Design a protein around this ligand. Structure first.
Ligand SMILES: [Cl-]
Ligand code: NA
Length: 129
């Protein structure tokens, strides 16, 4: 599923990401924009053989099991394919665990490079939330 901007914002808000650990809704929508272009089916292979999955490009090295990342962890305890669903529940739940591990949203390189320190509220602007 390719979400609309406000559609995703509302779905995220409903799943409790607004101000989750100090990160306002605009941060998560910006992050999802540049990681996956709002596409839940987005996948990307890393040079180390791991793969990033879904709307927030969660990495198989640490967070999910895809059965082809030797010596990796499954810290969110899910198959990586679960992160590709049109229902974003598993991605959101796993994201909550990632953002709490000490490094905040700096875990997402696109957020750090493209969202951090920008006017992130522009991403939820005009949306009925
Ligand atoms: Cl933080
Ligand atoms: Na893994």
């Amino acid at each position: 599923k390719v979400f609309g901007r406000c559609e995703l914002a509302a779905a995220m808000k409903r799943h409790g990401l607004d101000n989750y650990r100090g990160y306002s809704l605009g941060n998560w929508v910006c992050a999802a924009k540049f990681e996956s272009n709002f596409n839940t089916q987005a996948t990307n292979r890393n040079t180390d053989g791991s793969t990033d999955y879904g709307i927030l490009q969660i990495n198989s090295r640490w967070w999910c099991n895809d059965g082809r990342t030797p010596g990796s962890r499954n810290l969110c305890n899910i198959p990586c394919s679960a992160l590709l669903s049109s229902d974003i529940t598993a991605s959101v739940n796993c994201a909550k665990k990632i953002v709490s591990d000490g490094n905040g949203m700096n875990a997402w390189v696109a957020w750090r490079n493209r969202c951090k320190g920008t006017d992130v509220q522009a991403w939820i602007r005009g949306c009925r939330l």
